[PDB]
Amino acid sequence: PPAQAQGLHVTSISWNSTGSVVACAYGRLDHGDWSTLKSFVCAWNLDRRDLRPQQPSAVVEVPSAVLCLAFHPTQPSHVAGGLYSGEVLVWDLSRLEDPLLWRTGLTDDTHTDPVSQVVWLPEPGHSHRFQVLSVATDGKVLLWQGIGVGQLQL
Amino acid sequence: LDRDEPPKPTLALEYTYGRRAKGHNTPKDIAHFWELGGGTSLLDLISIPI
Amino acid sequence: EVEETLKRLQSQKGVQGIIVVNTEGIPIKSTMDNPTTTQYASLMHSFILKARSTVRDIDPQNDLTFLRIRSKKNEIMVAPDKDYFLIVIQNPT
Amino acid sequence: DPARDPQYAENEVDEMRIQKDLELEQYKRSSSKS
Amino acid sequence: KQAIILKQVAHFYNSIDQQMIQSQRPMMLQSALAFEQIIKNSKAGSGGKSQITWDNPKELEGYIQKLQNAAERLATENRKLRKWHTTFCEKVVVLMNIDLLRQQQRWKDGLQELRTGLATVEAQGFQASDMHAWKQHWNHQLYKALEHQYQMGLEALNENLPEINIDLTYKQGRLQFRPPFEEIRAKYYREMKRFIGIPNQFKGVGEAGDESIFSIMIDRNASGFLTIFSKAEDLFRRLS
Amino acid sequence: RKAVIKNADMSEEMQQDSVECATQALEKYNIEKDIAAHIKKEFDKKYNPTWHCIVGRNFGSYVTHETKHFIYFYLGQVAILLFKSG
Amino acid sequence: RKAVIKNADMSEEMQQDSVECATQALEKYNIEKDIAAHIKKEFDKKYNPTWHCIVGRNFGSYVTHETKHFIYFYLGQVAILLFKSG
Amino acid sequence: RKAVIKNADMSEEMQQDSVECATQALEKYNIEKDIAAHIKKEFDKKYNPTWHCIVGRNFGSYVTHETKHFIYFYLGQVAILLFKSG
Amino acid sequence: RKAVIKNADMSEEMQQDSVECATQALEKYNIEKDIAAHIKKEFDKKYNPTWHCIVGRNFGSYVTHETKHFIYFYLGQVAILLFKSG
Amino acid sequence: QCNEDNVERDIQTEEIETREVWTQHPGESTVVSGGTSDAVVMPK
């Protein structure tokens, strides 16, 4: 992102397994990540007519600092990333309302800790389903399904 | 001018014309017309076609 | 150099014909009659492609290294290529 | 009241202001004798 | 256990107070007051709230959840407001860059998108005061965008009209025209008229409102009539 | 993925749009039926009805097209056939 | 080559011809494009043009047909799409 | 040239005459404009003017007719609209 | 889309209005019969009855019209015939 | 005569040009063709 990249630095990058053209990046400031909105999620395609990489192909305005934003293997463009707050959000970029999230987590004892990472796993059920986990900083192994981001299951 | 056109209220140095014949032939007798109504841009427009 | 080797090969009693198929079934050099030259080039072009697909389907990081097909009448060998391969027919008997 | 003074906008009026001036100034510089 | 949620409701209050004022749409300013009232209702016992967490935080959890439920409703409205605000901004900044003499279809297309955006606002079940704020404010910005289009024309109207061709030939020692000269110049003049007849028939944001909001520009910038008609006459003089 | 045009009875501008439209459809959808539906609908809107689109990995076809409105191309291993008729 | 009709907007007699035509095409022709061509041509002759035919094992489509001139069915594992448009 | 009448406000004898007339017109004339012209003229002679005829494979219309002088029918794939007005 | 007038025996005002009316009709309706109905009804109101309108891609016609009340033009690939008679 | 004139017009739309075309996903380098200089080899 042109303007934002002047002050921010990259801390989390990824590729969409499905849309190999889709490169994701997220920069942020090193300090103050506990209070304000710090940055945006910048994506750009390396696809036909993408002659201006500086022009994002998508921007997700995340309410707080997010890290380790990755794509589910099977789904065209569906992601989940961990916020510094300790909450994991699930966006569905299918709606092209890029900042608009699908599901939100809780704020109670379920997962108050400032989780350090978010990872996907295949669910034992139909292969289309991928559980989302976080790495608790307190000693919890946290797994849930999509709608399950609220009222986590393991 | 022997037209069927609806009238326009406003005028901004409008142009129209008509054609007449004589009877031994059609010489294409063309008449040019200009019009303007109200105290609007009087000299700015009247001074142009004259 | 290559022409001399091809002639020497053709002189071998086992060899029944050689075809140099270049542009995907379009030959330039042959030691055979025209109907056979054209048919053979086409068949082996399609045939080798099928073998290469088969290998990639078995493992997505391997291609063809060599292909041999045998029959009662004669035997045909082809080799993988970037731009074009060469066809040899011999009588195994 | 074309001024539209008791109103506020940032991106709309700034860009219109800039474009308005740039086009009009170019047309004046054309120095038409008309 | 409580600070995690207490900071949220405190922040929303302090934040909304200085973010809703960026748009001045009652949709958000009025409902934010209703939220403030929920806060004040709890604040009526502020002196006692100051001592809850120290001994038993559960009572405060209840007070916070109440405020958070209101915060969730207000946050939802804020998101809708921000979405619309961007939507209308983007379309207006495009319309002002559309030359009516070349890309008039794109002018109309953008206005249709704005009307859809407005329909989306009203479809949410709003009252006259809220939908008025939206449409009337953006209508004024559209005025400036459209006036720009009109002013540009008045300076270079004749330069950007549709092409007209005419064949000259000689017959029996007289100059003949095909089509007649008086005809092609009449078409020329009508094209000039057609342009100026656009910035006073406007169906965009607030199409059910008063068209006067725009038509005033025709008389206000009428000093440009001398320019476009003087150029027109000089061209015909030169043609003559 | 990589676009390879094998046959075309179509203007250069429409050819590129067909590929671009299919590319976007392939990015958004996994199901061939839905990819085809996107491609067809977009062409009816921009270039007038009536278009037809077939997307798949294994088929043969024999169809009739209006001149200047047919293309057959690949995106990776997926073939897209798009034309007007009717 | 057992026939199973999945969807049709077609009279019962035309449905029978569709299966019978495809059945003969599959008996006679090994190549997908040639099977499709056989089927299409038989319909143009009997029910007038313009018919289109797709024959294959892996595809999706979104097409427009003339009312009462659409069928989609399988012969074994191979799908046949047969319709008029234009 | 099998005839199917879709709508008529016309006597039965004129309905039959119209079909037979149009059927001959299609046997005699290759071009729709000439087919239409033939049909129109035959009605002006027998049934008084002013008749109008539209012949084609793809059209819609909205017209005003004199009571008891309208028919719309197909001959095969070709639609014929025949009515009196004026 | 782009209007191209091929034939007209009609005043300049009605010519342009016919195009404008057909343009709106084509934007509003997909079915030819409804496009024609829009165009016809508008003309009866503005220029007195009785107008008739034919809209389509494939037809021939032979009609009789009043002097100075006939136009034939295209919007894209769709032909519109509009005239007064009666 | 009230019916002072009765102007007749003929109208004919144009025809539509169509072609038959082959396609096939699995196959040779030339997918489909409409129903000997060999200077193609020389560059290589």
From TrEMBL, chain E:
Location of this chain's protein in the cell: Cell membrane; Cytoplasm, Cytoskeleton, Cilium axoneme
Subunit comment: The cytoplasmic dynein complex 2 is probably composed by a heavy chain DYNC2H1 homodimer and a number of DYNC2LI1 light intermediate chains.
Family from the record: Belongs to the dynein heavy chain family.
Name of this protein: Cytoplasmic dynein 2 heavy chain 1
Organism annotation: Homo sapiens
Portion of the full-length sequence here: 612 to 851 of 4307
